[PDB]
Amino acid sequence: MIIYDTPAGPYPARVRIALAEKNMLSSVQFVRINLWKGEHKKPEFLAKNYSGTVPVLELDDGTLIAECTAITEYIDALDGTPTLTGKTPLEKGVIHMMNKRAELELLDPVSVYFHHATPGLGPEVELYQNKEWGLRQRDKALHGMHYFDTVLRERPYVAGDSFSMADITVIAGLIFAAIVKLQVPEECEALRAWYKRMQQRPSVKKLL
């Protein structure tokens, strides 16, 4: 298997962490995509991924699977024993809800804030920027932190009693927040305590 990404990318982080959680890092050849050069917006890469994002998984027969959720679902199912995406109908439902909610309410908004209300990847890459939209997305992310704090006051991991894809998405959200210096509020003690734990997992600790 081939992964096209950048090592320090918060979105690439979601797949690299899941790969380590599945003991599959060695089954993967990583190919560097040069985000600082806008390689993700050039025709060669767009042929790999219309949406122009990393990471992208390339299977041995040439098959391309893009998007963090799709890649995680693929690799989790490989060994026939899913540990990140859910065994029962309930687990799949709850993990996907929380995973989607982490994307919508924390990760994507931080990303939008990065690309639109800061210099982001620079003026040659960031050809259109909408500051005001970017800034509202920042506030959305902050509210997301408070939401995830209320979850983690009741459950030890984002989707309940076990670690899942959804924890990885929140982890990537906090990694991106740190990049743009969007501070987790002091009062979000459960989110802070959970993150401190997450920071100790081998899959995460390695990546960081």
Add this chain to the structure above:
Amino acid sequence: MIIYDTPAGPYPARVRIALAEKNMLSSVQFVRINLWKGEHKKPEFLAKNYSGTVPVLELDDGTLIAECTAITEYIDALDGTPTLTGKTPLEKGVIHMMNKRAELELLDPVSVYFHHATPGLGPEVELYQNKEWGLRQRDKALHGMHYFDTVLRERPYVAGDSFSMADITVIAGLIFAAIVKLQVPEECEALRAWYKRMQQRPSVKKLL
């Protein structure tokens, strides 16, 4: 099972279609959420779904599962024989990629265009609107139509040889496009031919 939605909502459409595809419509009690009154943004509903969107599934024991992808994953897994979300690791990977891409490149942008660059649900509901962002999302949706036309020139359904969750997402995208009169370009003949087929499926034909 209980579904909280509005019958004519394109997002509710994704779950209602999947329910019909699974022969489960009768297992469901639908409760009307009054979008025109901003009921989705009031505290009672927000307690059901922080993100403030329909549909939401309520299980008999009170469990709440929100978000179209999560609900579809739950109901598809119920009878133990998944027909919408994939059996093999490849199928799950490809269906989730195309499903996410339909959200990102077609459905969500149409929705953003609706709520931000038209009157949407009205001034009392649409408290903040960013026209310019809404209009760029319209163009993004149009490009999405051209992307999905290129897919459907090579495969009979969005994720390949069989109908999936990803076709339902594109269907909901085209339903929403029709609501805001965003025209599918004449030249998108494969997208048009596929939709015309989709329009004949019992699950869809019923809904419409």
